[PDB]
Symmetry: C2
Subunit: 210 residues, 2 copies
Amino acid sequence: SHMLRKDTPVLHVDAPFTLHLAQGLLTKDVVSDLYATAPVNRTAAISRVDPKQYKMNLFYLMVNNQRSRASGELPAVWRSLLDDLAGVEFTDWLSESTGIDLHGLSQDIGVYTHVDGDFISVHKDKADKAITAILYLNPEWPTNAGGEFEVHFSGDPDDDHVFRLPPRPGQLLAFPPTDKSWHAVSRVDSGEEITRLTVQLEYWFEHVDR
Amino acid sequence: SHMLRKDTPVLHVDAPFTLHLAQGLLTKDVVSDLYATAPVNRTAAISRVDPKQYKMNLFYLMVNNQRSRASGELPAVWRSLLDDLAGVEFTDWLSESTGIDLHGLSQDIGVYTHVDGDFISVHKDKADKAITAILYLNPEWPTNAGGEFEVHFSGDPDDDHVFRLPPRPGQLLAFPPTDKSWHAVSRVDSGEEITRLTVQLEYWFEHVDR
Ligand SMILES: [Fe+3]
Ligand SMILES: [Fe+3]
């Protein structure tokens, strides 16, 4: 559609693992529009806390290339973003950007929110999918509130060698699940009642209604 | 010395040009110590504004492996940072991190500050040096104040395809001057009287007192 800029160049990161980064996919005005109309009350709370640990809120706009019940009755701007993210034009851009062609795959689109106390511990995604892409929809993220994408250099949960990237409006991070794809989300520590808004796009190999 | 952590891993960026990124070289306590004692009043104002344009403040702690007059009478923490940045242990780390060996080269160390209105336009460094490394010494950089390292995808000054990285305490960016090494520093736009503090390390091939 008209939302995502299909001409934005990407940063290829060969560093501990393949990682692709883009900024400016959406204007600040559109991200503000999406954030103010965000269907955050449609999320469900999930958490795992015992020896990938996490605590977050989630609901799926699309599972296995099929729009969900929760994807109906959306604000116009969210209807447009879902159309664009599910469309062929964006899959073109993301397939050209990451070097993996994603066209015949089972696509999942979910809306994630992280509030104060939410986190995702160090882990590596499941190997049975081609690409995970994270779209950041916060107009402004405070600088000492956590909620940062963490590039890790090992799976040892005691390791503190980290490279962090804060959310930015219209930013997209995309990476395939490689043996080295260790990543995490630092605990959101704001106190000023802020909400970390993302949309994750998963491209699976088998077409199941998971 | 005891300042810079010689065991921090690096992010290799193969994207539009070779770029290496590291965080946590210094603790937040040391960066705060360096910033509060920063010899910013030893800088000189420089600027070029006509068709690499810039506006900034600068003075050199070291030119051609030789400590300058301005490098004397420094606070103890700045004496230690200069010793560490000029030492063999750090040149080891930076040579291993970037893949270029920097030992027999002519090293320049300068202290740069950018205030409100300061900037560096899109350009590509001179080809007669091996590596430029930028050490960021702001304890906290506000999120909408400019002063960001800009990864550009062409030399056209009308091009607005950019990937930006904000300053972080103890962060280091390092890259060789390749044909594609287009970069810039967005104009500092704070209004709250803030100072962008960096230390640049240049490794030249010829040993001249430039
Ligand atoms: Fe994950
Ligand atoms: Fe430069």
